[PDB]
Amino acid sequence: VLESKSVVPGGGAVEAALSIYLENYATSMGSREQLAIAEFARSLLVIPNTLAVNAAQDSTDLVAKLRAFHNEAQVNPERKNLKWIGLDLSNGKPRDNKQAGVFEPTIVKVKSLKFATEAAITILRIDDLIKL
Amino acid sequence: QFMEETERSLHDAIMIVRRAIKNDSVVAGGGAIEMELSKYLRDYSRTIPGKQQLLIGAYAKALEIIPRQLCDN
Predict the structure, then answer these.
(1) Distances (CA, A) of A85 to A4, A50, B34, B47
(2) What are the start-end ranges of the H helices in chain B?
(3) Among A42, A64, A124, B28, whose CB has the most other CB atoms within 10 angstroms?
(4) Which among A27, A61, A68 is the nearest to B47, CB-wise?
(5) CA–CA separation, B56 and B58 (whole Å)
(6) Do B46 and A67 touch (CB under 8 A)?
(7) List the disulfide bonds (chain A).
C-alpha cells in the first residue's frame, strides 16, 4: 500500500472479468487468435479454483457466479452487481474493498502474468530432448 | 461413377427448394447462425452462471462444430 498507492481492486475478481475482458478482446481478433486469447483466458481461471480447492470450496459456482457479476467488466465496489469487485478466501466469493475485498498491488500480477506466458512458450518452444 | 451425385444434387435442391417452400422462413446455411448463438450463449457464459456457464460455454461450442465439420472435411 505504502510504496505503491497504485493497486488494483480485487485479487480474484480480475479473473472472471479478465476472461470476459479477453473474451471480448477475443471475439474481434478472429482467426485462430480469437481463441489464442480465449485459451489465454482459460489459463486465468485456476486463481479462484486452487483457492476454493485449498479452501475446500466449489470453484465453478464462484468463478462462474463471478463471471456473472458484470454489465461491462470492471473490479469496483460501486457495481458488484453490474461489475466485479474484490474476493474472499475461506468462502472464496467476491468482496468489495473494505468488505473483505481483496486487492492486488498492480506490480505483482503483470510480472506473474509476464513470466508464465514467457516460460510456457519456451516450454512450448522445443519438440526434442536428445542424448547419447 | 460421376453421374449419380448430380441427380442427388438435383433432388437435394428440389428437396430444400420445396423445403424453402414447405417452410416460408429460410435462414442462412453453412452454420452461419450457430456462431452468433455460441456468443449469444457466450453472453450467458458471461451472463447466466452461478454455475451453468460451464454448460453455456460447453453447450454453445458444440453448435459451431457442425459447420466446423465442413471446413474440416
Answers:
(1) 20, 19, 33, 16
(2) 4-22, 32-47, 53-72
(3) A64
(4) A68
(5) 5
(6) yes
(7) none
* Buried/exposed code over B29-60 (b: 16+ C-beta within 10 A; e: otherwise): eebeebbeebbebbebbbebbebbbeebbebb
- AA identity, residue A121: I
At A109, list the grid cell. 500480477
The C-alpha atoms of residue A4 and residue A6 are separated, in whole angstroms, by 5
Is the Cβ pair B54, A27 closer than 8 Å?
no
Q: Which three cell numbers stand for residue A6?
A: 497504485
Resolution (A): 8.2
Q: Are A45 and A63 in contact (CB under 8 A)?
A: yes
Q: Residue with C-alpha cell 519456451? A: A122
Torsion of CA B5, B11, B15, B20, to 10 degrees: 90
B42 contacts chain A (CB < 8 A): yes
> How many residues comprise chain A?
132
Locate B30 and state its grid cell. Answer: 453453412
